C-alpha cells in the first residue's frame, strides 16, 4: 500500500499554530500522549473525547499494535521535529523508513467536525509557499503600499508616537490572533465562555463574514491552473524548428547522460597551444577541450549565478555542435504563444538567457505554428534548415480554451485543434443554498 | 443609507475570452442569420470569427484596471512596488512583481461589493430566432449578452465543432441555456423581486 | 490545407558565410528559429514559366 496509505504525523510547531488554538475553544480535554505503553484503547478513548483524531507523541518507541491502529485511523500523530521518525515506531517488519513521504496539506477541515471555525483552505499554503519569506520591516511596506492603493491613507498605523521619545515603530507580523484576555500577571488566559464575550472566542481573521466568502472564492481563482501563467525552466536545445504546438518540449534520446552542472567540471586546461576550457565529464574523467565532440551530455543547470561569461557560453556553444541538452532549471519567464502571421520580436539572445539576474522575469514568445498555410507547390526549395534553441520545460499554454478554429479540408479537424471543454458551458442550477454547481450526470 | 454595494447593470466577470486570429483565413460562403439570432449569437460567433488561432482566458483589465495596480497585459498580473527589497530600487521587471500581482487581485476579488440589476433585457419569441439557439434560450435573454463557446453551435462554419458542440451539449450533463431560469428564490422580495439570470 | 496565395512572413535569414577557414564563436546565437544560408543570398531560381 503506497502514498497516503500509512501513518501521517506533523511537526509540533504546525500543530501548535493551526490545530491547537481550536482545540481550546471546543473545551474538550486536550489530546493524549503517544507513549510506549498506551494500547489501541488509550488512543481510542482520547479521540473518543477530543473527537478530533490527533494524538501527541512524547514517549520512546510507539511499539506494539496501536501504531497499527493508527494505520487503521487517521490519528495523525504530532511530534517534535522529524528525524529517526522510524526509530520511534517499532515497524517490527521493515516498511517504515525515514525517507518515504507524500508530504501533504491535509486541509484542516478534514479533522474537525464543528466546521464553524475552520475557514479558507490548502489553497493558501499554495500561495504563501510562493511569497518570498518577508521580514517585519518588509511587511510594514507591503501593507503600507496596499492600503495606499485602497486609498485609505495610513499613517502612524502600527507605529507609536509618544513625544520625548521618537516614534519608534512596533512590528506588524501577527499570523493568527486570538483576543484572549490576560490574567493580571500579564500572561494569556485560556478563553472562558462565562467571563469573556462570545465574539472573541475564535476571531476569523478580523474579516467580516460576507467579505470572507469572496475570499475563498478568490484564492480559489488565484490557485487555478488556468492562471498560473508564470513558468519556470527552459531547456536549450539545438534542433530543427518543426512542430506546431508551442507546449512541445523535445524529449532527450537514449544516449544522453545526466550531469548536474557545477563549477567543479569546467576547468581551464591547455591542449594544442590555446587554453581550451575543457569539460571533464564525471562518469569517466576525460577532459574534452574543443566543444565539438564532447560526449552526449544532458546538462542540468540549477545555479546559473556563478558562470563566467565564457565557460557558460562554451557550454551553450557545445550545445549547438554536440546536441548537449542543457536545462536551465532556474529562470521563471512568461510565455506568449503568439500566432505565426506576426511572429516574434522581443529577441532573447543566448548570451542573455545565461547571464540574466535571478529576478528579471523576461518575456519569451513561442510560435503558434498550427495556422500556417501549406507552402506552394512551386515555392523555390529552401536550402538550409531553421535552427531553434529555447524550449519550455513544462507545458505552456494552459490559458488555452480552444484553438484552431478553421476547417482542415472542409470536414476533418486540423491536428492540434482543441474545441472547448464541456465544463465551459455546463451552466447548471444552484445548490440547496447558493453555491452554483454543475449539472448532475444523471446520478444526483 | 450605507453604500455596502454597488448595483451595476451588466456585470463584468473576472476571466474573459480573448482571441487572436490569423487574419488571412475567411470562409467565403457567407453565413447570414436571422436578424434576431444575429443579436443573441451576436458577439459570441463574431468574436469567434473564422480564423482565430489561439484563444486565451485572460484575467481582463476591464475589471482589473490599472486603477488598482495589477497592470496585466502579459498573462501575468504583475502588480508593482508592493513587496520590494527595502533599501534599494525595485528591479525593472522583477519576478516577485508577479507573486504580488496575484496578491492585490485576490484582494480585489476579496472585495467586489457590487449588486446586479436586470438591464434592458429583451424577449424574442420563437419564430424570430433559430431553433438551435432557441432551446438554449429560455425567454428574455439579457439584452447585453456575453460570449460563450456553445450558442456558437450550428452558427459557425468550422465544420468540426459540430462534433464538439452539436455533440457536446448533447451528453446527459452539460445542459446549456442562457436566459431567465427558475431560482428557488423566484418570488422573494426586497425592494424589488429577484429574477434569476 | 491550402496553397499560400497571400504572402506569409518567414524567420529572418542570417547568412552563414563559411569561408575556407572561418572562426566559430557563436555567442549571440539568436534563439527564435532562424534560417541559415551558407551561400551569400543566392537562391537563384528565376525563369517564370507562363
Amino acid at each position: 500500500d503506497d502514498l497516503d496509505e500509512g501513518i501521517r504525523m506533523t511537526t509540533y510547531d504546525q500543530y501548535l499554530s493551526h490545530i491547537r488554538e481550536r482545540l481550546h475553544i471546543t473545551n474538550v480535554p486536550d489530546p493524549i500522549y503517544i507513549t510506549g505503553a498506551s494500547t489501541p484503547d488509550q488512543i481510542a478513548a482520547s479521540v473518543q473525547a477530543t473527537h478530533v483524531a490527533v494524538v501527541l507523541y512524547q514517549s520512546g518507541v510507539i511499539n506494539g499494535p496501536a501504531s497499527t491502529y493508527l494505520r487503521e485511523n487517521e490519528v495523525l500523530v504530532v511530534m517534535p521535529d522529524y528525524y529517526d521518525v522510524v526509530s520511534r515506531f517499532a515497524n517490527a517488519n521493515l516498511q517504515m523508513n525515514n525517507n518515504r513521504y507524500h508530504e501533504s496539506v491535509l486541509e484542516i477541515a478534514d479533522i474537525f467536525d464543528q466546521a464553524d471555525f475552520i475557514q479558507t483552505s490548502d489553497a493558501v499554503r499554495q500561495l504563501r509557499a510562493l511569497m518570498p519569506t518577508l521580514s517585519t520591516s518588509q511587511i510594514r511596506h507591503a501593507i503600507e503600499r496596499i492600503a495606499q492603493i485602497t486609498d485609505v491613507d495610513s499613517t502612524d498605523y502600527g507605529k507609536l508616537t509618544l513625544r520625548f521619545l521618537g516614534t519608534l515603530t512596533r512590528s506588524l507580523k501577527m499570523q493568527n490572533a486570538q483576543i484572549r484576555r490576560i490574567r493580571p500577571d500579564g500572561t494569556v488566559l485560556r478563553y472562558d465562555d462565562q467571563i469573556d464575550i462570545e465574539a472573541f472566542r475564535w476571531s476569523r481573521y478580523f474579516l467580516d463574514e460576507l467579505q470572507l466568502r469572496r475570499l475563498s472564492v478568490g484564492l480559489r481563482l488565484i490557485t487555478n491552473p488556468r492562471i498560473a501563467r508564470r513558468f519556470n525552466g527552459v531547456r536549450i536545445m539545438y534542433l530543427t524548428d518543426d512542430d506546431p504546438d508551442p507546449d512541445f518540449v523535445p524529449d532527450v534520446p537514449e544516449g544522453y547522460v545526466a550531469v548536474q552542472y557545477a563549477h567543479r567540471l569546467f576547468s581551464s586546461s591547455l591542449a594544442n597551444k590555446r587554453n581550451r576550457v575543457t569539460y571533464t565529464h564525471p562518469p569517466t574523467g576525460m577532459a574534452y577541450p574543443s566543444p565539438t565532440g564532447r560526449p552526449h551530455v544532458h546538462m542540468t543547470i540549477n545555479e546559473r549565478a556563478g558562470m563566467s561569461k565564457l565557460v557558460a557560453d562554451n557550454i551553450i556553444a557545445s550545445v549547438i555542435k554536440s546536441n548537449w541538452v542543457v536545462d536551465i532549471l532556474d529562470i521563471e519567464y512568461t510565455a506568449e504563444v503568439m500566432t505565426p502571421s506576426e511572429g516574434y520580436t522581443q529577441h532573447v539572445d543566448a548570451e542573455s538567457i545565461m547571464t540574466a539576474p535571478k529576478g528579471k522575469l523576461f518575456h519569451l514568445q513561442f510560435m503558434d505554428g498550427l495556422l500556417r498555410p501549406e507552402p506552394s507547390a512551386f515555392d523555390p526549395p529552401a536550402s538550409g534548415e531553421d535552427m531553434r534553441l529555447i524550449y519550455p520545460l513544462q507545458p505552456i499554454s494552459v490559458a488555452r480554451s480552444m484553438r484552431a478554429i478553421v476547417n482542415h479540408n472542409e470536414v476533418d479537424r486540423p491536428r492540434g485543434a482543441v474545441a472547448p471543454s464541456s465544463y465551459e458551458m455546463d451552466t447548471g442550477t444552484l445548490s440547496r443554498n447558493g453555491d452554483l454547481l454543475y449539472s448532475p450526470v444523471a446520478n444526483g | 443609507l450605507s453604500d455596502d454595494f454597488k448595483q451595476i447593470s451588466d456585470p463584468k466577470g473576472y476571466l474573459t475570452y480573448s482571441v487572436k486570429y490569423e487574419d488571412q483565413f475567411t470562409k467565403k460562403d457567407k453565413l447570414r442569420a436571422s436578424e434576431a439570432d444575429d443579436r443573441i449569437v451576436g458577439p459570441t460567433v463574431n468574436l469567434f470569427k473564422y480564423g482565430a488561432a489561439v484563444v486565451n482566458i485572460d484575467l481582463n483589465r476591464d475589471f482589473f484596471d490599472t486603477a488598482t495596480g495589477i497592470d496585466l497585459t502579459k498573462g501575468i498580473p504583475l502588480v508593482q512596488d508592493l513587496l520590494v527589497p527595502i533599501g534599494v530600487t525595485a528591479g525593472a521587471e522583477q519576478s516577485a512583481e508577479y507573486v504580488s500581482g496575484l496578491l492585490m487581485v485576490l484582494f480585489k476579488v476579496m472585495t467586489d461589493n457590487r449588486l446586479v440589476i436586470v438591464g434592458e433585457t429583451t424577449t424574442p419569441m420563437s419564430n424570430t430566432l433559430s431553433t438551435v439557439v432557441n432551446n438554449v434560450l429560455r425567454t428574455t435573454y439579457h439584452n447585453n449578452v456575453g460570449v460563450n463557446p456553445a450558442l456558437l453551435r450550428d452558427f459557425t462554419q468550422v465544420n468540426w465543432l459540430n462534433r464538439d458542440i452539436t455533440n457536446m451539449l448533447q451528453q446527459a450533463g452539460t445542459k446549456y441555456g442562457l436566459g431567465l431560469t427558475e431560482t428557488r428564490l423566484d418570488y422573494v422580495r426586497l425592494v424589488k423581486t429577484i429574477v434569476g439570470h | 490545407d491550402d496553397v499560400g496565395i497571400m504572402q506569409q512572413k518567414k524567420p529572418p535569414t542570417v547568412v552563414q558565410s563559411r569561408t575556407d577557414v572561418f572562426n566559430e564563436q557563436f555567442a549571440n546565437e539568436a534563439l527564435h528559429p532562424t534560417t541559415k544560408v551558407i551561400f551569400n543570398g543566392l537562391d537563384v531560381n528565376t525563369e517564370v514559366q507562363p
Partner: peptide, 26 residues
C-alpha cells in the same frame, strides 16, 4: 496585401444601474 496578424479582446460594459421611474407590477 501581406497576411496581417490581429487580436481582439472581449468587450466590457457595466453601466451603473440607470434609476427608473416606472413600477411594473401592481
Amino acid at each position: 496585401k501581406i497576411a496581417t496578424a490581429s487580436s481582439a479582446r472581449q468587450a466590457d460594459v457595466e453601466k451603473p444601474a440607470d434609476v427608473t421611474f416606472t413600477i411594473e407590477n401592481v
